[PDB]
Design a binder for these strands. Sequence first.
RNA 1: AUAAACCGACGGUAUUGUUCAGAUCCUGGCUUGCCAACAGGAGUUCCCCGCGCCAGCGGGG
Length: 159
Amino acid sequence: MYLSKVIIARAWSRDLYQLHQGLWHDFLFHVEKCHVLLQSAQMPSTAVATVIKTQVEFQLQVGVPLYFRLRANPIKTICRVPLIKEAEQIAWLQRKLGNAARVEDVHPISERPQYGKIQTVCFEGVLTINDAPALIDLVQQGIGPAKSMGCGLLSLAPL
RNA sequence: AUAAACCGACGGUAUUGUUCAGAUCCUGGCUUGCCAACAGGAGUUCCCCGCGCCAGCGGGG
């Protein structure tokens, strides 16, 4: 797996839809500022997508505390309507995390809407590793819908 | 097609050389920006799709 720092020329970075194409020329990305973090199965440089820096497969361990950040699209369905309640969001997060890890503490930041509409929510907090390999697959696959719209990328950090 | 008509005012040419504006000079004394305050409310998201008990859950844009 490859962890990267990618810059996508402002000309390209006009709308959300244009974003995944530039990096394509699946994988996972999260917008930092267009500044972007790129998690890819292959090593990532186009004139439309310059690469500042790029390879990692973590050892990890069981029962280990880690900081985490994740943009996601928590929604219901009766159209994919957003989950606005703080309780629903935190419950949503632990659910989709399954048995990979438990949510010790988390702050759900109801991000500003992006453009059909996409209501993103950034979950920040700390986890402890319950199922180590199941956590990796969750990272390498992403979490939630609108995964190509910057959502779904789970970032992890020690303490 | 008129005291009109036709119809040059023309030619040559350094304004030059010299020259401190200069000495003296606090802008200065006085002066709360101050009193009140949950960031909370609100599930619209327009598609394709897969699996349902039809309630709702997923993967691709």
